[PDB]
Scaffold this active site. Structure first.
Site, PDB file in Angstrom:
ATOM      1  N   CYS A   1       0.870  -1.192   0.000  1.00 30.39           N
ATOM      2  CA  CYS A   1       0.000   0.000   0.000  1.00 30.39           C
ATOM      3  C   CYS A   1       0.880   1.207   0.000  1.00 30.39           C
ATOM      4  O   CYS A   1       0.875   1.992   0.975  1.00 30.39           O
ATOM      5  CB  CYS A   1      -0.903   0.012   1.229  1.00 30.39           C
ATOM      6  SG  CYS A   1       0.022  -0.921   2.396  1.00 30.39           S
TER       7      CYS A   1
ATOM      8  N   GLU B   1      -2.273  -1.535  -5.245  1.00 29.46           N
ATOM      9  CA  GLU B   1      -1.223  -2.541  -5.109  1.00 29.46           C
ATOM     10  C   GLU B   1      -0.870  -3.059  -6.494  1.00 29.46           C
ATOM     11  O   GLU B   1      -1.725  -3.129  -7.380  1.00 29.46           O
ATOM     12  CB  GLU B   1      -1.642  -3.716  -4.199  1.00 29.46           C
ATOM     13  CG  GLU B   1      -1.959  -3.279  -2.782  1.00 29.46           C
ATOM     14  CD  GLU B   1      -0.709  -3.227  -1.909  1.00 29.46           C
ATOM     15  OE1 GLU B   1       0.411  -3.288  -2.473  1.00 29.46           O
ATOM     16  OE2 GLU B   1      -0.849  -3.086  -0.671  1.00 29.46           O
TER      17      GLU B   1
END
Length: 221
Positions: free
Chosen positions: A1, A104
């Site tokens: 992240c 991601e």
DNA sequence: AAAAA
């Protein structure tokens, strides 16, 4: 992240957490408008001090003077409360970073495909954060980190880690100054939003370049 | 004293 989106108005996020009487945050109707939030920039960060919620632009990253590496951007929930480096932030520097979702990159051979990950129910996310108080000083080395957890069920298909996302109720309790670090560990465990509550889809590879900031970056391809 | 492109 290591990238996320924070595009809606302050009210769009704050309305799920607290009414005006609990805030010390000026009203602003302008959408924050950030679709591609990157480490090393200042990010609007929510925290509690003097019994009110505050919103400060805080450096995303943490590099103390004795730290000889690029700033860290994440802290693992499994050990942050125990770590010599992070325990003080876990005790004193808990915060919430609200967002629309996060990105991601799934590695596929030598190629990388970005995904945008968001709540299936359409709500924004409240990511657990820890950082260096006082947040309002605008420090450019010791800011905040996003707490991570092991990716669970479906999210493991994209990436092995994920942000620790809290329910709106747990996010409020997480920020309270009068709750202990052990209480905060209980809140993190019981308030974590499970992976089954998230959806994701591939997005344009243009998100890789931090120069790109369009609304299209969170749309499916 | 640890974890995005």
């Amino acid at each position: 992240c290591g990238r996320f989106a924070q595009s809606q108005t302050r009210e769009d996020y704050l309305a799920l957490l607290a009414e005006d009487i609990e805030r010390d945050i000026p009203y602003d109707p302008e959408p924050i408008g950030r679709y591609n939030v990157a480490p090393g920039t200042k990010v609007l960060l929510l925290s509690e001090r003097d019994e009110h919620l505050h919103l400060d632009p805080v450096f995303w990253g943490y590099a103390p003077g004795w730290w000889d590496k690029p700033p860290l951007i994440n802290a693992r929930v499994e050990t942050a409360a125990t770590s010599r480096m992070f325990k003080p932030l876990w005790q004193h520097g808990r915060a919430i970073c609200f967002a629309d979702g996060w990105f991601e990159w799934k590695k596929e051979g030598d190629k990388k495909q970005p995904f945008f990950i968001y709540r299936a129910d359409g709500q924004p996310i409240f990511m657990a954060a820890i950082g260096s108080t006082p947040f309002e000083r605008g420090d450019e080395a010791e800011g905040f980190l996003i707490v991570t957890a092991a990716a669970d069920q479906g999210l493991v298909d994209i990436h092995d880690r994920r942000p620790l996302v809290l329910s709106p109720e747990a996010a409020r309790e997480w920020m309270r100054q009068e709750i202990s670090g052990k209480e905060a560990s209980e809140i993190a465990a019981s308030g974590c939003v499970p992976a089954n509550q998230f959806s994701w889809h591939p997005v344009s590879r243009a998100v890789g370049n931090v120069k790109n900031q369009g609304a299209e970056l969170i749309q499916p391809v």
